[PDB]
Amino acid sequence: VLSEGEWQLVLHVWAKVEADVAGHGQDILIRLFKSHPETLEKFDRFKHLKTEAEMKASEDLKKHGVTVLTALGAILKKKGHHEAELKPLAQSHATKHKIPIKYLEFISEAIIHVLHSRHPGDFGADAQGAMNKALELFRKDIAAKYKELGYQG
Numbered sequence: 001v002l003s004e005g006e007w008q009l010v011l012h013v014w015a016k017v018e019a020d021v022a023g024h025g026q027d028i029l030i031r032l033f034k035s036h037p038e039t040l041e042k043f044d045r046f047k048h049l050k051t052e053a054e055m056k057a058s059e060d061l062k063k064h065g066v067t068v069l070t071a072l073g074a075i076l077k078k079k080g081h082h083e084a085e086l087k088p089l090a091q092s093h094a095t096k097h098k099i100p101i102k103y104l105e106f107i108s109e110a111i112i113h114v115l116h117s118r119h120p121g122d123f124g125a126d127a128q129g130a131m132n133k134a135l136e137l138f139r140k141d142i143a144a145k146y147k148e149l150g151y152q153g
């Protein structure tokens with residue numbers, strides 16, 4: 001599992017994320033969209049945005065970035081005991097949104113990139129390693145629920 005010390009590192013950086021969720025969530029989604037364009041085509045509500053300027057301009061994209069980080073935050077503060085929060089997310093993303101497990105890896109890279117940008121002195125190699133373990137645990141449990149449903153990535 002993650003140690004209690006690695007969970008400390010994770011949540012100490014997330015409390016800073018919580019001081020500007022809407023800004024963090026918008027940067028993360030933008031980074032996902034540009035680095036991996038195919039993920040934007042999964043969003044009927046965002047599929048119209050072509051440039052980074054248009055993305056930055058959209059209130060609705062910002063609204064959805066808040067939705068995602070709030071849901072991720074609820075999960076991370078359970079420190080691994082997240083069965084009830086994670087189960088509905090896997091179900092929706094499996095059966096309704098149809099999101100390949102690989103795209104959950106892409107958004108995980110996006111989160112880490114943005115956390116490094118916004119919090120250097122605060123997001124050293126050790127905190128980077130803890131956060132990547134926590135995201136791999138996230139991915140690992142959703143993947144298990146996907147397999148059960150017939151979608152395995």
Ligand code: HEM
Pocket residue numbers: 039040042043044045067068069071072088089092093097099103104107
């Ligand atoms: C940490 C990663 C993610 C979290 C925490 C997350 C969370 C959520 C939440 C809470 C919702 C709204 C309720 C729901 O539909 O069940 C949602 C909706 C949605 N998510 Fe995710 N999501 C994540 C990653 C992704 C990725 C990587 C994609 C696509 C590449 C994706 C696509 C969607 C879509 C298409 C919706 C519906 C948007 C709309 O039309 O209203 N999600 N997500």
